[model samples]
Target chain A: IKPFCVILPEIQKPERKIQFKEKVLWTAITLFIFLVCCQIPLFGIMSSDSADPFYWMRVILASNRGTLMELGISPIVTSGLIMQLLAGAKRALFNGAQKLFGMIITIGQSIVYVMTGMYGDPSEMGAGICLLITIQLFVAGLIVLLLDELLQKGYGLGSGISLFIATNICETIVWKAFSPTTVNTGRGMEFEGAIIALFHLLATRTDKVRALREAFYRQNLPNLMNLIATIFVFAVVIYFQGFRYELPIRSTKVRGQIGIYPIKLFYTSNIPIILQSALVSNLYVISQMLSARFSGNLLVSLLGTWSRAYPVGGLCYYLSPPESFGSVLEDPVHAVVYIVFMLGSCAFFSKTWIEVSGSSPRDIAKQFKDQGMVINGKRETSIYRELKKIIPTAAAFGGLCIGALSVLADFLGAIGSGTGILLAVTIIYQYFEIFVKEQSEV
Target chain B: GLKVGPVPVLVMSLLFIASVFMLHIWGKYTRS
Candidate 1:
């Protein structure tokens, strides 16, 4: 680990105390660079009509189709997943291996995408062009790695992975709200943005009442209702953040000093939803590839039927959330299946993540013991037992709440989708907390 | 635009990553 650390690209901690302004500047620069990379197209590949297989996951993953940011946070997240499992508690070794594994996965994923005709077939683009595409993606992957490292090293506001995702999600919402782009909706040319289309429809159309109705209930593009739904979800999430349970504790060393350890209602935060998204997207990718080749195969058809990257039939269809309220009414079974699966899986993931993430009751008990702290009303010997009762329950119940909220948001057709908006709200609140603390410290 | 095929693209991409890495290491040493 020591020997290989020299070559690994790592950001060193600042020797001096960095002022708040400098941190803001560095963070802004990092975000600007990331946004630029998202727009820059890869040299070799031209856009095609092959509907993106992972379109649903894009808002969470920070991926852009046919751009340098195509792979986005996948390589980093994948590396973290494996490294956490393998070297769950190593410091230097884990950090070194994370960068190494991330780089390798970037190369591997890039090759797979290219070979799988994600960027046009190798037969037409030529193997050389394919190889070139891999190189570009690898370089972009390295840039993302370094950007994340820079943020974590205290030059920026938060971890780059979360920052990138939050930015992408919020960007989607804002773009949908105010985008200037116009598209042919068969009715006529209509603005894609909800607010823009609302005005344009009112101004251009002769019937004012019809324009208002169409703007409110447009099916093809983001409508006024979707924007209102987005705001409502955002407000609800912020309200939910305030719901937490507190456990009182006394510090033995400080001679009767007491405090409460607060666990937010979102004990697992957005992780279960992220995990669910990852699982569903992976299944979508595999099912799409299989069904594309074996269109008539019974097993593949039972698994999924993909027409333009949407799961229209089979188990995949039920697993996927309804596109809108109309779809829910059309097939109530899919909505019920999705809600049950989401709530159950979220509860399960939340419980499991507590153990895997080293925040289990036993671990916390040890930490309390080390700090000479004990539950206010309980004996020190039974610290583990007390924690075991509340932590798991909190985690599982919290997950169900998050899942239900997500389902509700989707049902309302919230802009940027339900999961995306939920994630964005939590992430923004986190940043807000950080800024408040940092400012107080300064 | 003229296509600058495989070999040049590979070198340019490699150089970009390589240079950025060198810059990171250099900045660590030079920065206060």
Candidate 2:
């Protein structure tokens, strides 16, 4: 285990203590590298069409199709999940092992994707070009891994893996809201941005009533209502920051008995959502690949039926969220089934995560005991039981509520999808807290 | 029409892999 882990490349920790300003500079540099990678097209790719299998998964994974960052943080995320579940309570060797697993998975995925002709069929591109494309993806994966290490090794603020995802989500939302690009949507050329289109139509169109209505609720591109919904989701997420259960605890030594232990309503936070997304994305990839090979088989049809790489029928369709209220009305059963699946899976993951992450009742109780603190009006022996009663309920209910909130956001057609908006708001708030703390030290 | 001989392509790939391994070499030194 040790030898194999050591075989994987690692980033050295800073030789001396890094200043806050220097850390900030490093973080900015890291982000610039990631953004550049997202823009640069991969070499040796012949052509790719809009029939993308990863359409739904790209936003959360920080991936940009046909680019160097095509795989994005997916390999890292998948590797992390495997490591966490394997070593639920053991983390002393977790970092090195995860790095090794990530590299292997990255290389494997590169081969899998290229050989499967995601870029183009092997005969068209030739074996040489296919290998070349795979090499590019492999190197890009290594660069991403190194950049994340450079951040996590105490030279920057927060985890680089998360920063990438959050940045991608925020960028998507902004691009959808304010893009200056124009496209003809079968009804003349229109600005892509919601706000820009609204104003442009209002000014140019002769009929004021028609323009106003079109600007408010257009389907060809983003509309005013989507922007409003995005803002509403952000506000709700920020407001949830205040929801927490505070338990009073007392210290044994001639100390005050007024310390508050806060258990937030989002007990598991975004981990459950991340897990859920990973599950769905993996399923989508497998289903797409399977259906492509066995399009006419009865078993394949039961799993899913794909049209232009989009799941159009069967189990996958119900599992996927509706595009808008129009689809929801057309297929209410699909909508209801999806909502149920999201809520149940999120709650289940949340409760299970507490145990795996060492936040279980016994673990917390032991930590409290070590710190010489006890809950007010309760014996030390009852600490574990008391926590057991409240913690699971909080984790389950919080996850369910979050799942419902995301569903609501999706139904409203929020700019970047509801899951993405949820993730972005949480990440932004976390970075804000970190920034404040860093400033206070000065 | 574009054409690249096998030798140059192999050399290009080798250099790219070796350069990437430079990060590993540096980290290995720190570990040892």
TM-score for all predictions?
0.88, 0.85
In the range A1-442, model 2's lDDT, one tens digit per residue, is: 8777766556666778678788778777777777877876776666776367676678777899888888898888878889877865555356878977888898888877776656777688878777767778887887777777777777777787778989898888888878899998577878889888888888889758899888888887888899999999888877885588888888885477668888888888787788888788777877887887767888778788766466779888777888667787888888889999989988999989898788877888988888888898789788888899888888999889788878888888888787898788777777776788778768
Q: Residue A441 lDDT in model 2?
A: 69
Model 2 alpha-carbon drift over 4 Å, by segment: A1-8, A15-21, A85-94, A206-209, A253-258, A308-310, A324-327, A439-442, B1-32
In model 1, how large is the Cα lDDT of residue A160? 83
What TM-score is obtained by chain A of candidate 1? 0.93
DockQ comparisons of all candidates to the true complex? 0.04, 0.04
Q: Pick the candidate with the highest lDDT.
A: 1
What TM-score would chain B of candidate 2 score versus the native chain B? 0.56
The lowest-lDDT stretch of 10 consecutive residues in candidate 1 chain A is A1-10
Residues A149-172 of candidate 1 have per-residue lDDT tens digits of 777878888888889998999888
Instruction: List the candidate 1 regions with Cα displacement exceeding 4 Å.
Output: A1-5, A88-90, A324-330, A439-442, B1-32
> lDDT tens digits, residues B1-32, model 1?
12232224334445674554564466567865
